[PDB]
Each structure stands twice: as C-alpha cells, then as structure tokens.
Nucleic acid binder design. Structure first.
Ligand SMILES: [Mg+2]
Ligand SMILES: [Mg+2]
Ligand SMILES: [Mg+2]
Ligand SMILES: [Mg+2]
Ligand SMILES: [Mg+2]
Ligand SMILES: [Mg+2]
Ligand SMILES: [Mg+2]
Ligand SMILES: [Mg+2]
Ligand SMILES: [Mg+2]
Ligand SMILES: [Mg+2]
Ligand SMILES: [Mg+2]
Ligand SMILES: [Mg+2]
Ligand SMILES: [Mg+2]
Ligand SMILES: [Mg+2]
Ligand SMILES: [Mg+2]
Ligand SMILES: [Mg+2]
Ligand SMILES: [Mg+2]
Ligand SMILES: [Mg+2]
Ligand SMILES: [Mg+2]
Ligand SMILES: [Mg+2]
Ligand SMILES: [Mg+2]
Ligand SMILES: [Mg+2]
Ligand SMILES: [Mg+2]
Ligand SMILES: [Mg+2]
Ligand SMILES: [Mg+2]
Ligand SMILES: [Mg+2]
Ligand SMILES: [Mg+2]
Ligand SMILES: [Mg+2]
Ligand SMILES: [Mg+2]
Ligand SMILES: [Mg+2]
Ligand SMILES: [Mg+2]
Ligand SMILES: [Mg+2]
Ligand SMILES: [Mg+2]
Ligand SMILES: [Mg+2]
Ligand SMILES: [Mg+2]
Ligand SMILES: [Mg+2]
Ligand SMILES: [Mg+2]
Ligand SMILES: [Mg+2]
Ligand SMILES: [Mg+2]
Ligand SMILES: [Mg+2]
Ligand SMILES: [Mg+2]
Ligand SMILES: [Mg+2]
Ligand SMILES: [Mg+2]
Ligand SMILES: [Mg+2]
Ligand SMILES: [Mg+2]
Ligand SMILES: [Mg+2]
Ligand SMILES: [Mg+2]
Ligand SMILES: [Zn+2]
Lengths: 275, 32, 88, 115, 96, 65
RNA sequence: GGGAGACUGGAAUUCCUGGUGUAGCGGUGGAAUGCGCAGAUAUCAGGAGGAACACCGGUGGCGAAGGCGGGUCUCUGGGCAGUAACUGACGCUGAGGAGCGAAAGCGUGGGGAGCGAACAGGAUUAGAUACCCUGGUAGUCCACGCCGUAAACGGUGGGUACUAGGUGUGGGUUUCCUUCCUUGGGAUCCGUGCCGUAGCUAACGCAUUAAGUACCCCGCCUGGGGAGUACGGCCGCAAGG
C-alpha cells in the first residue's frame, strides 16, 4: 500500500512511503546473510569512475538463488516474505521438503502458506521454474536466462515482465520490457509470473536526506562550470554553452552501440521511443 | 413555439461565457 | 425475505392474542426484524440504492406507526420501546 | 505443381475486388486483381474489372492444372454475379457456392456518419 | 436443500466404463456432508456442433442433486479444477 | 395468426434437451424466427429463446453454421 | 431488460508468431498525403489483450424519475388477483430540510482493442482557422471521492368521486355452447395504444390514461429588452451552481 504524509513541516509536504502490508519478518536467517562494505564509487586505482555517487548506509547482503537446477522435482513451501534493500523487489524464504532453506525473488500475487513446484514438468502456478521448451506459448515470465546454465540475468526490477511468443526450431522469441524482440536458446530456464511490489513508481521522496541516505550526491550543472573544467563553462552571466550539448569529455550524443558485435548480425530490431 | 427567443438567449449566454473566459486571469488576480 | 416459520413465531411471541396479525405491536416487530436483516445485507452490499429506498420506506412506516401508538397511548409505547431496545 | 481440386476466394469492396485461387488446405496458387489488370482510381470498382481479374486468375490456375474449385464470396455486392459468370466462362466448374460475410456481434464501434 | 441439475462433458479419450466410479468419488463429498439424494444417468459419444479444446467428440452425463448452495459450489469448483472435464452447467429445476 | 401449441395442457415441456424440438424453431441459417411467424405466446416464446440459446452455449446447436 | 456480487460463453476488430505468395493495397463526385518490393493485401493454423452482447427484440415489459436486456449461481426491493382471519380513521398534501439524479468535467491510482475534442498533414475555394481523406492526445473503461446541472418534454403537480361507445395488446380470476382441444362466447380488476359523441378551448386539439362537471394542498406569472446580469450570502480544490 501507499501512505501519504500529512504536511506539517516545509520539507515534508507531499512526501510518501510504501505501506509494508506484505512484510512478515525483519530478521534474515543468520546462516544466509553475508557481509558487505561500501565501495565509495572508486576502483582499484583510487580515481572516481562515476561522479556524484557515494555515501549512504551500512548494508548487509543476502545470498539469492538464481540457478534452480540443483534441486529438481522436490516441492517447497513459502515461509515468509522479507524486506531487501539491495534490490527493488521483495524476497521470499522457501523451505524445501528435504530441509534446505533458500531465497528467491518474490513474484507478484504470492502469499504465505503456498506450494511452489520447481520441477521440469511442474505446473503453471506462478513461481515455478522450468525450461522454456516445456513452457506453453503466450505466458508471462521473469528472471530469464540468456544462455543455458548462465543464471537469471534479465527482468529483475519491480514492475517488469517478459512475454513469450511462439517457438520455432531451437529458438524462442521474447518481448523485452522495452519493446525489443530477442531470440534465446530454448534449453535455458525461466520463471512464471511477474515480480511483486509494482507500486515503486508512485514513491515521492520530498527531502534531500531521503536521497543522501540512499547514496546520491549533488549533480552540479554544466553552464555554471568554469570553461577549463567543462566544455560548456565560461561566459558572462548564464548561457546555453554556445555549442551543441556534449558530454563532459568532448564526445557528443548519438550512436553508442559498438557495430559488428557478435549479436549485431543475429538480433532482430531495436527500441523505439515514444511511438 | 418559435425559435427566435431561444436563439437570443443562447447568444447572450455565449457572450457572457466568452467574457468570463477572457477575463478569468484578471478576476483571479483581483479576487486573490 | 421473512418466511412462514419465523413470521409465525414472531407473531405468536409479540401479538396481543393468538389471532391478531395487524396489531401495531406485530407490525412494529415485523418491520424491525426486516430492517435488521436487510441492513445486515447492505453491510456487505454497498451500492444497492433501490434497497436503500426500501430502507427509507420501511423506516418511515415504522416511525409513523410508532407515532400513532404514542398518540393512542403512552404506557404501551414505553413498554414497546423498552422491550425492543430502540431509542424512539 | 498439380492439384485437381481447389478453392476460389472472392471479396468485393465498394471500390476494389480481389480474387485468389487456393488449395483446400488454404495454400494459394495464384491471384489476380483490378490493380494488376491495369485500372486505376474509381474505374477499379466497375464489374468489368472484376470480370477481367476473375478471367486472369482462372487462366493462371488452369496453367497449373486446376479442374474444379469451390467459390467463397464475401463483402458488399459489386460484381458478384459477373465474376461468377466470368469464372464459369473461363472453362472451370464450381461445386458449391458459399457466402461467408463477417458479421460482428455488436463489437467495436463503427466510424461516425458522413455529412 | 434445493433441487439442482448438473451436466458435465468429458473428453472422449477416457473409457466409458471408468467414468462412473469417477462421478461416484466426486459426489461422495456431497453425499457425506448434507445427507443428499441423487440420480445419475449417462449417454454420450455424440459429435459436437463446433470444435472445443481441440476435440470433436465427448461424453454427456446428467446428474440430479438435492444439496446446499455451498455444497454445489464446492462440487462445481472441484470438477472445474479437473483436467479431464470440458464444461459444467448447474441450474435449479424449480421455478427459480 | 396461427395457434400457440404450448397453451394446451397436452403441450410438451420446454428445455434445452429436446434437440429436435429446439431445431424445429430455428431457421436453417441458425437463427431464431420471429414470434409473428411462429404463432406462440410471449411466455412460451421467451422460454424457447432462453432454452435454445442455453443449448447453443452448452454446444448442442451451431453458431449459425 | 427492478438492483448488487462472483464465475463463465462465442462472433468481430487490432496486434504478434509460423507456412502459401506475387506487385500492389487503402481511399473520394474525381484525385493526393499513407503502407509495401528488408516481402504488403489475401489466405490457413496458433496466441495476447480490451469493449459490447446481432437473430429473440416490438410503438412490448419493469422502475418514483434518471434508466434497464450473453448465460449460470448467491442476496435483495416493488406490484397485481382471490379469501376476505386482524388493527379500527392510523387518510391526502407538504414552506424550510434530506436523499436519488443522463452526458460532459475535476483529484488519487490502474487499464487502454475500436472510436475520437485539441493538433498535424492531403484536397476544394478568391480566402477554409469547416463540411471530404490519411494519422491521433485527452476521454469513452475500472476502484474510491467530487460538481448536481439538460428540449431531466406528455413542454400537461399530487389525491379523490361522476360522465355514450368501438377496436388491438400484457397480467389474474370466473361461468356456459362444449369438442370442453378452442383470439367459441359471456362477467370482473389492474396497465398500455388508436378512432370517436355530450363538454371545453381564441384555434391546433383533449375526450374515462381529460386540457369536462366537482373538492383538498403545494409551486409558479403579471409588457419586450436591461438580466437569469450586478452587489451581498451559501456551496465547491476548479470549472461554476
Ligand atoms: Mg561482507
Ligand atoms: Mg599508478
Ligand atoms: Mg548520476
Ligand atoms: Mg563516511
Ligand atoms: Mg527494493
Ligand atoms: Mg523533504
Ligand atoms: Mg547540474
Ligand atoms: Mg561557478
Ligand atoms: Mg562562477
Ligand atoms: Mg584543475
Ligand atoms: Mg576546452
Ligand atoms: Mg564559451
Ligand atoms: Mg560563464
Ligand atoms: Mg547576457
Ligand atoms: Mg543557455
Ligand atoms: Mg550538443
Ligand atoms: Mg447583443
Ligand atoms: Mg465509391
Ligand atoms: Mg470511412
Ligand atoms: Mg415461463
Ligand atoms: Mg458492479
Ligand atoms: Mg506472414
Ligand atoms: Mg493476413
Ligand atoms: Mg422477489
Ligand atoms: Mg372483519
Ligand atoms: Mg419544496
Ligand atoms: Mg448522493
Ligand atoms: Mg461520465
Ligand atoms: Mg481539463
Ligand atoms: Mg478522471
Ligand atoms: Mg490517469
Ligand atoms: Mg493495443
Ligand atoms: Mg489542415
Ligand atoms: Mg482515429
Ligand atoms: Mg435548467
Ligand atoms: Mg428522457
Ligand atoms: Mg389533477
Ligand atoms: Mg384500458
Ligand atoms: Mg362536438
Ligand atoms: Mg373554434
Ligand atoms: Mg380523440
Ligand atoms: Mg388522462
Ligand atoms: Mg387550457
Ligand atoms: Mg420590466
Ligand atoms: Mg435575461
Ligand atoms: Mg449567475
Ligand atoms: Mg458574487
Ligand atoms: Zn402459449
């Protein structure tokens, strides 16, 4: 649910926060948490690779399962739904009948006290995982594998979904979340359903702190920059830069995808904006 | 029975509506 | 709608004697039972505006009958109020 | 290719007419239309264009060796009888005549009227 | 406690002899709950007017049951959850 | 105006089972004839319409084959 | 076709996947912008999604007025006829007040197949900011709140008793030619159409469903414009009433 704050202070007017009506617990399994440290936006050399990113809050990482091939044909029951900062969508805790405990992304519409079948011939209940060869055409999926045994590497953020079109030969055509069409080997695995927590878009923050805590720093504009530091800089007053807009390393906008890529001569079509 | 009276009333109402639409901004500035 | 069994037991319990059916006491008892049941219905069903019209008609009839009972007598009116647990 | 039994598909709109000869399984062999015959604009709607299209399609089908066809017709009537008669005269024979016109069951919304 | 009539269509792949035990085990739930009465008649293997679920033939069975609304809704959901059934219709035999 | 066969006390019952009875009241295009042609009363006409269209739903009559 | 909730049915348009297939397809009184030779239209199979339910269906039924029709299940309001067991004048009206109230419009959040204000082009005209053609954003849909207005018309307020007939139609009870099947015939109560006397009306027309002869209560009008406008006040986030 979405909760809206009643205005009582100038900085809090219009702010919002997601009402956690789907959470059950606030304590991850001690046996599955692993440590993590703030990288700070630098790299091995010490330089800043990406500007205006840093600061934040000491987060702990949860190990997620993105293979789902080791355990097959064994049912599992959903235990709890838990908060996860590292990724947008919520996560769920599973108890396998053999006793092992595991984490997975929480699909939309799931709830406590439910049975998830992960077999290669499992049912079409949302949350099941099975190879595309066995999945009927037209259904919706998420967490798709790019190549067999490669791990879930697509459609993971909140509100996203992929639609599976018909089949032919050894390839299946998938609608990307942004309108593209891509082929993939049918041997790979996928999951049925859509990721939950679709109400992320409506969040309105309203306060510079709610961004600084998440770890985004000021942006500083180009036209205010000095001429030496930025190509747009300089000028008496404020000006549009006196030159076509350009990134602050000299290279202008336009083409960005390296041609002759091994997928260039095999993939179908590109994105279209605002049709 | 006829239509002339209705047409006249319609014309007057249209003129008044157009005047209000055009003067909206001045009305708002004066009132507020 | 009320059926024969509950209608008969209400009449037997609230009537002045074993043959009256049109007595104001029986009228009020039947009306209040109907209102209770149908209000319970509208508790779950929200947008039945025709049923709301039914509520209004039944409430008006009950109020008017109670007014007549008050006009004819006072002790009977008070006894009916206390027995049915209403306010007016 | 060679097919003894085939099917004929004819549709006639208010300003065009297209005819195609197809196998019983649905595959097409040859097709003809007024545009291919060589008529442009409003001249395309005359029944004579439909007759020429039907004759050309029948000839091209007889080239592949089609003996009998079944006619499926649809659309508002412009050159129905003329096309059927031209197909008859072209040297082919029809088994059955079936009228299958798409009739919506009060779906969608038609475009507004003309003034 | 009202009279109901139920018609169920079964796919032709099933055997004629095996259907009746399936119906009995389906209606056992009603029989054990509301102390109901029922009568079962079977007559099938007839061509269908139009293609359904990529099938052309089917089995028609008519059932008469006297049970509660909740029990009949239970039966309906249980049947429709099955994969060997095609269609189900339930209606009252009385005036309403 | 011809006579309504169902107002009689000897008239047969109407339901979505009698395939021939339902067929006799529909045109070979698969549609329902008008009450003016049929000659039956309003109640029986509606009962016949409901029965035929229920049978059509339960797949015993074609959708205008 | 009185209302609400749940489940579910097929046709059709669009889109997408996969075969057949060759250069056109769409369009108007006549032509052009448009989509194709990177494979269109057409045709066959499969899939996805949204809205509405031909034939029954009509000057027919229901609701106080707006309005109401794909099927099945659950809850629920009102009316009509008969017997007449019961209460025993408890009836009508209703200033202010409260409730319901077509389509458009506004706030929050979803969904978006078709249609389509605003806006682009194409065409006609001396000028087209239009009628015509190709595209298309709000909106039309759903949930929760708003505003409360229409030729919201039978241009005819509510209740009651009386005043020649005739002919269709819906619903329910009765009796006789009697097959007793039967728009065979007769009596009675309610609803809905058309033609007609006495009567009324300036005339058009109304005529047992009165604009007739009568009684009770409420609203409204006193020459056309100025004006349903100005000021004040109430309501509303805004349009505005
Ligand atoms: Mg660590
Ligand atoms: Mg170094
Ligand atoms: Mg940045
Ligand atoms: Mg620090
Ligand atoms: Mg997250
Ligand atoms: Mg703030
Ligand atoms: Mg900046
Ligand atoms: Mg500076
Ligand atoms: Mg400076
Ligand atoms: Mg420097
Ligand atoms: Mg420089
Ligand atoms: Mg400079
Ligand atoms: Mg400067
Ligand atoms: Mg300057
Ligand atoms: Mg500038
Ligand atoms: Mg630039
Ligand atoms: Mg003037
Ligand atoms: Mg034309
Ligand atoms: Mg058009
Ligand atoms: Mg009936
Ligand atoms: Mg609803
Ligand atoms: Mg194709
Ligand atoms: Mg096609
Ligand atoms: Mg009822
Ligand atoms: Mg008496
Ligand atoms: Mg008043
Ligand atoms: Mg209201
Ligand atoms: Mg609206
Ligand atoms: Mg607006
Ligand atoms: Mg809106
Ligand atoms: Mg919106
Ligand atoms: Mg779409
Ligand atoms: Mg223009
Ligand atoms: Mg359009
Ligand atoms: Mg008005
Ligand atoms: Mg109206
Ligand atoms: Mg009067
Ligand atoms: Mg009458
Ligand atoms: Mg006279
Ligand atoms: Mg006169
Ligand atoms: Mg008259
Ligand atoms: Mg009258
Ligand atoms: Mg007068
Ligand atoms: Mg004056
Ligand atoms: Mg005025
Ligand atoms: Mg005013
Ligand atoms: Mg004022
Ligand atoms: Zn009859």
């Amino acid at each position: 649910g979405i909760r809206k704050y009643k205005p009582t202070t100038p900085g809090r007017r219009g702010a919002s926060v997601s009402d956690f009506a789907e959470i059950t617990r606030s304590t991850p399994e001690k046996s599955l948490v692993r440590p993590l440290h703030g990288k700070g936006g630098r790299n091995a050399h010490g330089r800043i690779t990406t500007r205006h990113k840093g600061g934040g809050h000491k987060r702990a990482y949860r190990v997620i399962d993105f293979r789902r091939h080791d355990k097959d044909g064994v049912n599992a029951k959903v235990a709890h739904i838990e908060y996860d900062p590292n990724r947008t969508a919520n996560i769920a805790l599973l108890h396998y009948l053999d006793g092992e405990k595991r984490y997975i992304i929480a699909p939309q519409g799931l709830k406590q006290g439910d049975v998830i079948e992960s077999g290669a011939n499992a049912d079409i209940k949302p949350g099941n995982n099975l190879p595309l060869r066995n999945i009927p055409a037209g259904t919706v999926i998420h967490a798709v594998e790019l190549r067999p045994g490669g791990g879930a590497k697509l459609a993971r953020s909140a509100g996203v979904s992929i639609q599976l079109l018909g089949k032919e030969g050894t390839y299946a055509a998938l609608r990307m979340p942004s309108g593209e069409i891509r082929r993939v080997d049918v041997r790979c695995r996928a999951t049925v359903g859509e990721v939950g927590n679709a109400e992320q878009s409506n969040i309105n923050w309203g306060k510079a702190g709610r961004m600084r805590w998440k770890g985004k720093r000021p942006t500083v504009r180009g036209v205010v920059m000095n001429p030496v530091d930025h190509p747009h800089g300089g000028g008496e007053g404020k000006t549009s830069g006196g030159r076509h807009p350009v990134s602050p390393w000299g290279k202008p906008e336009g083409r960005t995808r390296k041609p002759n890529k091994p997928s260039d001569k095999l993939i179908v079509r590109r994105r279209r904006t605002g049709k | 029975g006829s239509v002339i009276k209705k047409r006249r009333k319609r014309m007057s109402k249209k003129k008044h509506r157009k005047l209000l639409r055009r003067t909206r901004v001045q009305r708002r500035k004066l009132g507020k | 709608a009320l059926t024969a069994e509950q209608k008969k037991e209400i009449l037997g319990q609230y009537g002045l004697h074993d043959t009256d059916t049109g007595s104001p006491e029986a009228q009020v008892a039947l009306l209040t039972k109907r209102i209770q049941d149908l209000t319970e219905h509208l508790k779950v069903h929200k947008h039945d505006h025709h049923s709301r019209r039914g509520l209004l008609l039944l409430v008006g009839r009950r109020r008017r009958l109670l007014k007549y009972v008050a006009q004819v007598d006072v002790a009977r009116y008070r006894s009916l109020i206390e027995r049915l647990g209403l306010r007016r | 290719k060679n097919v003894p039994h085939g099917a004929a598909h004819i549709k006639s709109t208010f300003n065009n007419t297209i005819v195609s000869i197809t196998d019983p399984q649905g595959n097409v062999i040859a097709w003809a239309s007024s545009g291919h015959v060589g008529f442009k604009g409003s001249r395309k709607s005359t029944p004579f264009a439909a007759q020429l299209a039907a004759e050309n399609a029948a000839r091209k089908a007889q080239e592949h060796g089609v003996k009998k066809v079944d006619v499926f017709v649809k659309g508002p009537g412009s050159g129905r009888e003329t096309a059927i008669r031209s197909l008859q005269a072209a040297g082919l024979e029809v088994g059955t005549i079936s009228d299958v016109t798409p009739q919506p069951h009060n779906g969608c919304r038609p475009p507004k009227r003309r003034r | 406690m009202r009279p109901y009539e139920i018609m169920v269509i079964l796919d032709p792949t099933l055997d004629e002899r095996t259907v009746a035990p399936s119906l009995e085990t389906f209606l056992n739930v009603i029989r054990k709950d509301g102390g109901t009465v029922d009568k079962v008649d079977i007559w099938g293997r007839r061509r269908l007017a139009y293609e359904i679920a990529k099938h052309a033939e089917g089995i028609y069975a008519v059932i008469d049951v006297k049970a509660e609304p909740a029990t009949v809704s239970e039966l309906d959901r249980q049947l429709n959850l099955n994969e060997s059934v095609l269609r189900t219709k339930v209606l009252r035999t009385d005036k309403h | 105006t011809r006579k309504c066969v169902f107002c009689s006390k000897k008239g047969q019952t109407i339901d979505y089972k009698d395939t021939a009875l339902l067929r006799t009241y529909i045109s070979e295009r698969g549609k329902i004839r008008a009450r003016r042609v049929t000659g039956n009363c309003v109640q029986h006409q509606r009962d016949i319409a409901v029965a035929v269209k229920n049978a059509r739903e339960v797949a015993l009559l074609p959708f205008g084959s």
